[PDB]
């Protein structure tokens, strides 16, 4: 389980409550901005934002990533969404074509959105960097998914990603501690992984859905 003694400061985003500057290990992009208590990714109509660690993570051991986020200000289906990334690259990924993150990624995308055939979901997607994914088949191509309501709630959700080399490479995603999916078929190879979150709210209904980050905690182990 997560324990203070296992927290990795360099790959975490301490709770942004009362935080006046973006923590120096992270970089905002596009129109993401630090507002009171939170980084707002989609701060007005048809906006985009990114938040990535400045340094890569050398994958050598089991890990946990816990993201605390919310969506406020809009209820309704849109073509917006928020994506959480764990993808190999030598830099913050250059490409911005998939939810304001990389369409040609090598690793894992976790997408929270509501435009697919099951309504609001958390979905896992994989790609190996050889080609861009086909955005027109994303929902059929999810390797795992669960239902997840997220819109129009001021109470943040917590996505807990664990990758357990000591349990035959178990990749698990929990939402508010409840299992969303798990698999042993994804064996990430060695490399430097980029960790970040990106979002867009698109133009549907001239919505102002506001995707916001409160905290991220990275642990060694699970």
């Amino acid at each position: 389980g997560s324990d203070a003694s296992k927290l990795s400061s360099d790959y975490s985003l301490p709770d942004l409550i009362n935080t006046r500057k973006v923590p120096n290990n992270w970089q905002t992009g596009e129109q993401a901005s630090l507002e009171e208590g939170r980084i707002v990714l989609t701060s007005n109509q048809n906006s985009k934002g990114s938040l990535w660690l400045k340094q890569g993570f050398d994958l050598k051991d089991s890990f946990t990533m816990e993201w605390t986020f919310r969506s406020v200000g809009y209820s309704g289906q849109t073509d917006g969404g928020i994506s959480f990334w764990f993808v190999q690259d030598s830099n913050i990924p250059r490409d911005k074509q998939l939810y304001n993150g990389p369409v040609n990624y090598d690793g894992l995308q976790l997408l929270v959105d509501n435009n697919g055939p099951l309504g609001p979901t958390l979905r896992g997607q994989l790609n190996d960097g050889q080609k861009p994914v086909d955005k027109t088949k994303i929902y059929d191509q999810s390797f795992a998914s669960c239902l997840m309501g997220y819109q129009d709630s001021s109470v943040p959700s917590t996505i807990r990603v664990t990758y357990d080399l000591e349990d035959d490479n178990l990749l698990k995603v929990q939402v508010d501690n409840k299992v969303c999916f798990q698999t042993r078929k994804v064996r990430f190879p060695s490399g430097s992984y980029r960790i970040g979150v990106t979002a867009q709210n698109g133009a549907v209904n001239n919505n102002a859905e506001s995707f916001e980050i409160f905290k991220m905690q990275f642990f060694n182990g699970v």
Side-chain angles (χ1 to χ4, degrees), residues 104-106 127-132:
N104 55 346
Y105 67 97
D106 178 4
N127 192 47
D128 63 8
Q130 291 187 357
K131 281 301 173 66

Side-chain angles (χ1 to χ4, degrees), residues 39-189:
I39 287 170
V40 180
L41 301 172
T42 55
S43 65
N44 74 353
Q45 296 174 17
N46 198 6
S47 60
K48 289 178 170 171
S50 62
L51 174 68
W52 295 85
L53 277 155
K54 289 177 177 176
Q55 307 322 322
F57 167 66
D58 184 33
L59 178 60
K60 288 266 183 64
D61 279 307
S62 300
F63 66 91
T64 302
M65 277 197 309
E66 294 175 1
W67 283 100
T68 304
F69 82 103
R70 65 182 188 175
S71 170
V72 289
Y74 187 73
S75 177
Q77 186 169 46
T78 75
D79 59 26
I82 180 170
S83 282
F84 304 85
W85 304 92
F86 179 77
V87 297
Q88 189 163 190
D89 205 337
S90 57
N91 33 258
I92 291 161
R94 289 179 178 70
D95 186 274
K96 309 281 174 161
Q97 298 184 83
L98 176 56
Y99 297 91
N100 193 47
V103 74
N104 55 346
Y105 67 97
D106 178 4
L108 174 67
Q109 178 197 18
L110 300 177
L111 172 66
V112 173
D113 92 307
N114 70 9
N115 208 32
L118 310 198
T121 45
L122 186 164
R123 288 164 178 271
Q125 320 286 139
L126 296 154
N127 192 47
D128 63 8
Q130 291 187 357
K131 281 301 173 66
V133 300
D134 183 346
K135 292 165 43 194
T136 75
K137 302 185 179 197
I138 190 161
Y139 302 113
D140 219 343
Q141 297 197 341
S142 308
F143 68 90
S145 63
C146 62
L147 303 177
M148 176 183 183
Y150 67 93
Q151 287 194 314
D152 194 27
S153 178
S154 294
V155 179
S157 295
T158 310
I159 296 166
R160 177 167 194 271
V161 186
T162 51
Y163 185 60
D164 193 353
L165 295 160
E166 290 71 56
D167 194 7
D168 299 308
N169 317 298
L170 183 67
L171 172 66
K172 178 166 73 179
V173 173
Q174 294 158 280
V175 172
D176 309 332
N177 298 317
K178 313 165 309 260
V179 183
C180 175
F181 61 81
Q182 69 174 232
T183 184
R184 286 185 179 84
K185 293 190 303 188
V186 178
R187 298 187 292 183
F188 292 111

Side-chain angles (χ1 to χ4, degrees), residues 13-16 18-24 26 28 34-35 39:
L13 182 75
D15 194 324
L16 291 164
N18 293 164
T19 298
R20 284 175 283 175
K21 296 279 188 203
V22 174
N24 178 62
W26 289 84
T28 52
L34 179 58
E35 308 291 341
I39 287 170

